Design a protein around this ligand. Structure first.
Ligand SMILES: O=C1CC[C@@H](NC(=O)c2cscn2)CN1
Ligand SMILES: [Cl-]
Ligand SMILES: [Cl-]
Length: 163
């Protein structure tokens, strides 16, 4: 574990992370996809061998010795708000189990279901609070990756609020 486990946020491409493993915002079919998923496919294509997994789950595939945790959040275009909320919380609980099992000291993580799976809604707070619920009991350093300047400020504020 990390000596003083922390949360941080950075505004940059998660494919350039400085952590011991990465969480992909995956589709259920293990396809190259779009957005974060397509950046992950370009950087770690070997990690897409048998990476298909259902919604609300995480499946880890090694690229060399570098772990890629494929986490499948719900597409809110297809799920009800209620069922989507349940699957989004579940995906993050499976990420926490994988990060623990791998014994890593740090993990790079995007906000699940906030891009093309958002159903056209702002889900920063919903997704970030499910991330905290799952990751708070882990001792890995967590580095959250985003692309938007206003999202960086809001994520940073939420981290600092808890202290
Ligand atoms: O800061 C943000 C902006 C909206 C969403 N990002 C992407 O859609 C996206 C596409 S490629 C990388 N992120 C989540 N985070
Ligand atoms: Cl960048
Ligand atoms: Cl998404």
């Amino acid at each position: 574990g990390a000596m003083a486990p922390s949360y941080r946020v950075k505004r940059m491409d998660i494919a350039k992370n400085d952590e011991e493993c990465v969480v992909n915002a995956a589709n259920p079919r293990g396809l190259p996809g779009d957005g974060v998923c397509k950046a992950v496919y370009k950087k770690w294509p070997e990690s897409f061998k048998n990476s298909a997994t259902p919604v609300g789950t995480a499946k880890t595939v090694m690229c060399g010795t570098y772990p890629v945790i494929h986490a499948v959040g719900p597409n809110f275009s297809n799920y009800t708000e209620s069922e989507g909320d349940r699957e989004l919380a579940a995906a993050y609980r499976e990420v926490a189990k994988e990060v623990t099992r791998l014994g890593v000291n740090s993990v790079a993580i995007p906000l699940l279901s906030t891009g093309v799976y958002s159903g056209g809604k702002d889900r920063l707070t919903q997704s970030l609070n499910h991330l905290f619920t799952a990751m708070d009991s882990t001792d890995a350093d967590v580095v959250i990756y985003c692309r938007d300047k206003e999202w960086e400020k809001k994520i940073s504020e939420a981290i600092q609020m808890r202290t």
